[PDB]
Design a protein around this ligand. Sequence first.
Ligand SMILES: CC(C)(COP(=O)(O)OP(=O)(O)OC[C@H]1O[C@@H](n2cnc3c(N)ncnc32)[C@H](O)[C@@H]1OP(=O)(O)O)[C@@H](O)C(=O)NCCC(=O)NCCS
Length: 388
Amino acid sequence: MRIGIDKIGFTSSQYVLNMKDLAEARGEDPQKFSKGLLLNALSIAPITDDVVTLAAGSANEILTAEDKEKIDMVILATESSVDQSKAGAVYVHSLLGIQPFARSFEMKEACYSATAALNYAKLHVEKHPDTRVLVLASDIAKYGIGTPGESTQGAGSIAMLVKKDPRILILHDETLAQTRDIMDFWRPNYTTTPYVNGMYSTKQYLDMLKTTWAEYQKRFDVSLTDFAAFCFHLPFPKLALKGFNKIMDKQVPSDLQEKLKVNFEASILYSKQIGNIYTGSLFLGLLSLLENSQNLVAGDKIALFSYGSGAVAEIFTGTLVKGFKEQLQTNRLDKLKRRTPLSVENYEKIFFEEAQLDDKGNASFKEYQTGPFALKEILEHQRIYGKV
Ligand SMILES: CC(C)(COP(=O)(O)OP(=O)(O)OC[C@H]1O[C@@H](n2cnc3c(N)ncnc32)[C@H](O)[C@@H]1OP(=O)(O)O)[C@@H](O)C(=O)NCCC(=O)NCCS
């Protein structure tokens, strides 16, 4: 029984901050961003485009009426939640008109949780092969003005439809996760922006990659040469490049070294324009890879390294399905160029806007550019979402 990713949708916000503009405002060498981080631009979200609206937009990209009839589980992976009790998935379920007899909930573990969502989705469909599962990985990476992380901000959501006989990627059962209790990045309840030790996080990302991959190879009798591409979590592309270099070695034959490198470069193309999207970043890289590699074919295997701060890592794999290109888009870079560039001044005002509640819990918002769904208002503490 083949189970996996049938369709992948992606939505980002409608605004962009160009890194050269941020560099100019902050007195930074623009090459720190273009070469140091390997970032060109970041998506910026207004207050009316949040985890829920981005998630619903990404699903709207891919779902058919038949999907909506057969989906019986909706999982939102996020670290950008807008309620402490109500899962953002419930809103997505509603906004998309999915059939009522579904379970809907959120998963949380920094940038890692969509990997667990996908795994549960896969097992659920295997048990109930007539069903489909919608996994959303939606986040707004917001670090704060003047912080080291300001340059690794971003916004977006990946939607993945999981079902039997998938048209893109068959998911396999050989997985390995690792948990280690650390404080590289975290976000207490009283702050909209995380605390982060960037250098320590990089070191831990690389050590969990090294140790998890070593153990994976041992348990499952595989090596680098079994794969046509390796995808990494993508908070910024330089970190993923460090990961790639960390696990690669020169015992790989030269032709495969070249292929893996070209595929790595394909995988970071979108992230260079979008920035960090937390839970969705690994999967955005997968999408970028599939839409930009010139060498991937049916039957090629892909290895994926998921990381979340705090920290949890997992390696898993999949095999490409004949016809996968039919499910992809060719003009995504063109669509990203449509985003409205913001001055640093306007980015500061828009990205860091917070709701101004009256004593009854009402808040109103200016109309900003969004995708198909928007936060319209807050009405007596209820976030009101609708189609635009
Ligand atoms: C990425 C981050 C650590 C950078 O912080 P920073 O103090 O502003 O920048 P750094 O001094 O660390 O330099 C970053 C990089 O660009 C560099 N750089 C600086 N000036 C440069 C220049 N003029 N030309 C080229 N590169 C330059 C570096 O040398 C470097 O890359 P390297 O690690 O390969 O050497 C920071 O944005 C951050 O902490 N973001 C959040 C990370 C996070 O969320 N981690 C959790 C999940 S893994």
